[PDB]
């Protein structure tokens, strides 16, 4: 029940939400690489999560860095590049792939919040880097579930 | 981390949930109606939940009334009345459909609890009608799986 | 919000994912038979975790017991046995049906922290077994998700 091991569980469970977006989704070889090297940072940003912080020279970390958040911020501009402007708010569906990474995207935002609590039970020993990759992927998951729906998102209604 | 942020989370999962059941699960032209129209009540939920009540007279209120529930309690009634008694406990699954809504009732009872949790951090400040549309939600939710199992429910045993 | 039915509530949530591996996955008779025994377990494990343990001699019990631990302990060993070493670590994903079995897995492994907590929140009041089984569980659907994949696991990289 520690702060930690609930942020790396989230991640977990993140992870899967992908998986599963990518076996039922069918995504083309573009986006399926992207999500696989996604996994692949869900793994490191777990495993950062669940091993404190020390000031231990002798092996090598296995940490978040910025340069996979940075990562995320250039495939969030690229993709969102060739998307029109959002007319309305966007619910969360539409074709298989996208109502799947729409799934993972809340998944990913619960486990930020959690990142950003063990930060809180913690801030000397867990580093900020996992909850702010998990705050970018959101972000890039919303803009995949977009690309994902060729013939318009759903859409939300005042009505 | 608030309680109000927690709440207003849960409700997108539960809405990305309620996606994947149409995505996934094929459903009818009424039930997909019906489903839709969820959606866009669960994107009200969420921004009533996110937003604190003040005596603010100038911006038209974005909130869950009493109606969202009544029409809720009102579609559990109709689409109840053509299913038979319950032999024994059902278990989650069946079709694909009714898996999917299974899920989703799921999403929407923690949905739910977080929306209580909100009410009890702020009493006067939080509305308690999203907690009372995502109680009614998980009724209904479980019905349609029920509708959406014409060949029979799984169930329990004892055994 | 009581820690015994945010158990029971993430119980059900399990169960519903195992509900979805099953209708979406497409499992042979034999793995469908044991995700059923499964379904029917978790089903006891909620009522256990929601009912407060009195010295009430009058109803018959329906409690995790021993036994179903055993159980899931014989078939880890059984299904684990048909699998090559693992070569790296398992990233969550591959067929459907392993998709699945992970998302499951991750659920499961969320249940298992709420039912510990059920048991700290109450360690005379709550049994330890349903926590044991999930526990064990989530070994079990971790082993049939490598079974589900039969040209390999996805694989985390270094790289």
């Known amino acids: 029940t520690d702060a930690r091991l609930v942020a790396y569980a989230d991640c977990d469970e993140a992870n899967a939400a992908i998986g599963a977006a990518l076996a039922l989704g069918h995504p083309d070889t573009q986006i399926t690489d992207v ?25 090598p970390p296995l940490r978040i860095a910025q340069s996979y958040i940075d990562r995320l911020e250039g495939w969030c501009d690229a993709y969102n590049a060739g998307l029109p402007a959002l007319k309305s708010f966007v619910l969360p569906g539409g074709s298989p792939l996208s109502a799947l990474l729409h799934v993972a995207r809340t998944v990913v935002r619960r486990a930020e919040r959690s990142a950003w ?12 880097l996992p909850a702010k990759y998990l ?25």
């Open 135 to 159: 705050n970018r992927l959101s972000d890039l998951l919303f803009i995949l579930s977009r690309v994902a729906n060729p013939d318009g998102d759903v859409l939300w209604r005042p009505g």
């Open 35 to 59: 999500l696989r090297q996604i996994q692949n940072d869900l793994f490191d940003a777990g495993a950062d999560l669940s091993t404190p912080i020390v000031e231990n020279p002798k092996h």
């Open 117 to 128: 609590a063990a930060v809180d039970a913690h801030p000397e020993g867990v580093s900020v």
